[PDB]
């Protein structure tokens, strides 16, 4: 029946995927052994979306870990839930990527690609019918970015009628990890805009700022970021995992949420981000959550949505409140904040409430919007790419791999066209 196949790429992708698996296992009541220790009702019927039916009721995960470094599988396996996955899916090579996109795509992307295609085709044939494929990776390296684009292209070529959703990590000039990071981001954007259905923006600096200034944590680490992104993913996927009154699915969003195929980027966000001392002093209501989901402070963007206009908005709720409050809130917001959304298209916010509350928290609601704020990131990426491609720095490595430089030129032309398109649709006037 309707199942979702999950994919893994990049060390950060691997760790966030493991965190998501642990979070969903805890929420649905699964012991680290592999059996079932839940006590709910809807945690048995649609549990097969991410698991598989086996003897003795031992559900197995459905995720393929793709990596170029063997040191990642050892790290993720030693965890409390690393002994539950399929070791066959841990397809690792012998040579690392070295934060190179071209080298990994060519060298470590030819003789290793066949095995992961074989395992994913076996998994797809194992189920009856599927909807889409979820891949969580990062653009910071040659592992997630070099292989994710190739595998997405392969699966789209083989099975065009599937959902291509991903949650890659955007870079940031303030917080970097690779000197040639803008090169790899440049190379990845072309494949993302050419051979990907939808893509969501993930930033680490914004999450760090959010936790520091709102959560007020002592020693924030990558574990907190993985926890937050996993909670975001569960909030996104609860529309299908836990059906309620008004259920939705990934493709209905991706159709209603994307005006043009060349603009498929989104802006994801969670509402209740409070400090440890404020959990016992809070007022659970609609207007508070609307304000936290509308302001730019809770938003995990490393930019300002207020500089442009809102294009499409989706408010996904998870709780038992009402229906009237959401629509009245949206109506009055559109009435007052008239200079923040496209006037040519009214009713840009979608209503969605999940009647099944999450485990451990009664109230949850995730924000999936596509506001006019990413243009700053695109233009700065283009500017830095131009600056570094002017004198052709850090290029002899890619040249020594064998690929020519015309790919950089066609890519930069593509981003210039795309940023021109974004700025031209930014101030969408009614008439002349």
């Amino acid at each position: 029946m309707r199942e979702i196949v999950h994919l893994q790429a990049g060390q950060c992708g691997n760790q966030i995927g493991a965190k998501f698996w642990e979070v969903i296992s805890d929420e649905h009541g699964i012991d680290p052994t592999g059996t079932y220790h839940g006590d709910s009702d809807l945690q048995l019927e649609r549990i097969n979306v991410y698991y598989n039916e086996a003897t003795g009721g031992k559900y197995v995960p459905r995720a393929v870990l793709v990596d170029l470094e063997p040191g990642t599988m050892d790290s993720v396996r030693s965890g409390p839930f690393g002994q539950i996955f399929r070791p066959d899916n841990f397809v690792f090579g012998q040579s690392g990527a070295g934060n190179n996109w071209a080298k990994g795509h060519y060298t470590e992307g030819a003789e290793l690609v066949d095995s992961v295609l074989d395992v994913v085709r076996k998994e797809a044939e194992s189920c009856d019918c599927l909807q889409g494929f979820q891949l969580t990776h990062s653009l910071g390296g040659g592992t997630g970015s070099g292989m994710g684009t190739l595998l997405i292209s392969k699966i789209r070529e083989e099975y065009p009628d599937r959902i291509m959703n991903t949650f890659s990590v955007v870079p940031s000039p303030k917080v970097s990890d690779t000197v040639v990071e803008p090169y790899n981001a440049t190379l990845s954007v072309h494949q993302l805009v050419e051979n990907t259905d939808e893509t969501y923006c993930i930033d680490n600096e914004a999450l760090y700022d959010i936790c520091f200034r709102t959560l007020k944590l002592t020693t924030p680490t990558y574990g907190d970021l993985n926890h937050l992104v996993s909670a975001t993913m569960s909030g996104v996927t609860t529309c299908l995992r836990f059906p309620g009154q008004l259920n939705a699915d990934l493709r209905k969003l991706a159709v209603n949420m994307v005006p043009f195929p060349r603009l498929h980027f989104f802006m994801p966000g969670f509402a209740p981000l409070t400090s440890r001392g404020s959990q016992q002093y809070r007022a659970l209501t609609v207007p508070e959550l609307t304000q936290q989901m509308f302001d730019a402070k809770n938003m995990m963007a490393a930019c300002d949505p207020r500089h442009g206009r809102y294009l499409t908005v989706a408010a996904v709720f998870r709780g038992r409140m009402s229906m009237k409050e959401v629509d009245e809130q949206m109506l009055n917001v559109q009435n007052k904040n008239s200079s923040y959304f496209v006037e040519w298209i009214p009713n840009n916010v979608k209503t969605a409430v999940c009647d099944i509350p999450p485990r451990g928290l009664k109230m949850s609601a995730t924000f999936i919007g596509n506001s006019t704020a990413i243009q700053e990131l695109f233009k700065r990426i283009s500017e830095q790419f131009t600056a570094m491609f002017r004198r052709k720095a850090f290029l002899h490595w890619y040249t020594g791999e064998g690929m020519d430089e015309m790919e950089f030129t066609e890519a930069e032309s593509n981003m210039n066209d795309l940023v021109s398109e974004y700025q031209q649709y930014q101030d969408a006037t009614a008439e002349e």
Binding site: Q11, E69, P70, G71, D74, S75, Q94, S95, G96, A97, G98, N99, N100, P173, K174, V175, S176, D177, T178, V179, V180, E181, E205, Y208, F212, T219, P220, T221, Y222, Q384, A387, M388, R390, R391, A393, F394, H396, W397
Partner: protein, 439 residues
């Protein structure tokens, strides 16, 4: 997997390898016998020691390194040591004649005699290993062995293995203090080989080591032991994510790929921190921001060069110990806005995050204290080109009247090679000055 082979040429290379191996054995709890005699009270050792050592069927560890020298006295000095039961005699090749600060003999009439033996040794070592990433060649420019023999071996290793990383670690002759006289003569020829046949090269001197030890450690009578200890700590910090794991592992390839902006400019600036003694590590609050800021201080650099004379191409920063990401982010935000540090208008940012869970350990008998976390940095700047300018000036003023050149002519070598090396160094300096110039 992540396994590398170390090469030690000359007395300095041999002693540096000895210091590195003893540091590795003490940090991993490896006993000098070669087995695990600790059957009563365990103190560690259950880790991934395959990176440098090898596991036998009887529980023995075999080091994987090359200890070659043209003079037998150093081999005998190590052989009469207490660690003689650890390595194998076949790995310490003796010799009748030695270069002893001479390039011509040790490159033509001496180094060309022992070639097949070392080649067979290294081939067997590679065959015994599964995954090879790079090499750890330890030599010196002043020493004739570690210059002529090192160049002749590296030229063959480059053509025998093109897909393997070729590192370089040696000592650069200080302009103020020096040990011999013909050091620039060997350096001018070794630099050409290391530039046009290798991928990366690290230069350090001893004057800066003396300055930092007297300034922080506050010692009046230094010795080579501390000098070797500092280099061993640096090497351990560099290859830290290999023997162990962490939040963001940084392998050899991961950092060498970005550490080389151009084939001609592959000469980074290392800086270890904190370099402090026992009393200097007790009543001093240590955080990440302070040490990162101190890392850019010229007084803490191992190369005597003012960073403010130029600006930076690329910076590679690593960490080892209980480092918190928020502190790293705060330090990055602090340095990116600092006016004193100079950079270019084409590289707004670039750096690496290597988080190592294993804290650096200590040695009973040394001067280093127990510090909760460490940091090392590898930046690329054009302000270091002055050392090559001074070296070229010295070689020019020595070569005008051809001082101590008749010996090399009698040995057999082309005098035109001096002009070739001079013009190659001039071209390299021109490239460096062109790169340093912005728009």
């Amino acid at each position: 997997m992540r396994e590398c082979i170390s090469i030690h040429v000359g007395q300095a290379g041999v002693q540096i390898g000895n210091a590195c191996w003893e540091l590795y054995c003490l940090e991993h709890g490896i006993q000098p016998d070669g087995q695990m005699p600790s059957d009563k009270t365990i103190g560690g050792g259950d880790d991934s020691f395959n990176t440098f050592f090898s596991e036998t069927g009887a529980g023995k560890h075999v080091p994987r390194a090359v200890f070659v020298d043209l003079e037998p006295t150093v081999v005998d000095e190590v052989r009469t040591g207490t660690y003689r039961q650890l390595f194998h005699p076949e790995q310490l090749i003796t010799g009748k004649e030695d270069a002893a600060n001479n390039y011509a003999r040790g490159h033509y009439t001496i180094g060309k005699e022992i070639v097949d033996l070392v080649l067979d040794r290294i081939r067997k070592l590679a065959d015994l290993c599964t995954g090879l990433q790079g090499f750890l060649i330890f030599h010196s420019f002043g020493g004739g062995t570690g210059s002529g023999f090192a160049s002749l071996l590296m030229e063959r290793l480059s053509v025998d293995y093109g897909k393997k990383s070729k590192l370089e670690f040696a000592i650069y002759p200080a302009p103020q203090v020096s040990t011999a006289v013909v050091e620039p003569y060997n350096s001018i020829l070794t630099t050409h080989t290391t530039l046009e046949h290798s991928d990366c090269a690290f230069m350090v001197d001893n004057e800066a080591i003396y300055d930092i030890c007297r300034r922080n450690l506050d010692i009046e009578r230094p010795t080579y032991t501390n000098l070797n200890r500092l280099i061993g700590q640096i090497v351990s910090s560099i290859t830290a994510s290999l023997r162990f794991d962490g939040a963001l592992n940084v392998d050899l390839t991961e950092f060498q790929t970005n550490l080389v902006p151009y084939p001609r400019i592959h000469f980074p600036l290392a800086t270890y921190a904190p370099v402090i003694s026992a009393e200097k590590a007790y009543h001093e609050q240590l955080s990440v921001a302070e040490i990162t800021n101190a890392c850019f201080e010229p007084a803490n650099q191992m190369v005597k060069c003012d960073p403010r004379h130029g600006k930076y191409m690329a910076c590679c920063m690593l960490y080892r110990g209980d480092v918190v990401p928020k502190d790293v982010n705060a330090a990055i935000a602090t340095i990116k806005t600092k006016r004193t540090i100079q950079f270019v208008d084409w590289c707004p940012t670039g750096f690496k995050v290597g988080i190592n869970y294993q804290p650096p350990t200590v040695v009973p008998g040394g001067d280093l204290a127990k510090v909760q976390r460490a940091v090392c940095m590898l930046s690329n700047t054009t302000a270091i080109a002055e050392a090559w300018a001074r070296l070229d000036h010295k070689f020019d003023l020595m070569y005008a009247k051809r001082a101590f050149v008749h010996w090399y002519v009698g040995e057999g070598m082309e005098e035109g090679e001096f002009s070739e090396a001079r013009e190659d160094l001039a071209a390299l300096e021109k490239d460096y000055e062109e790169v340093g110039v912005d728009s």
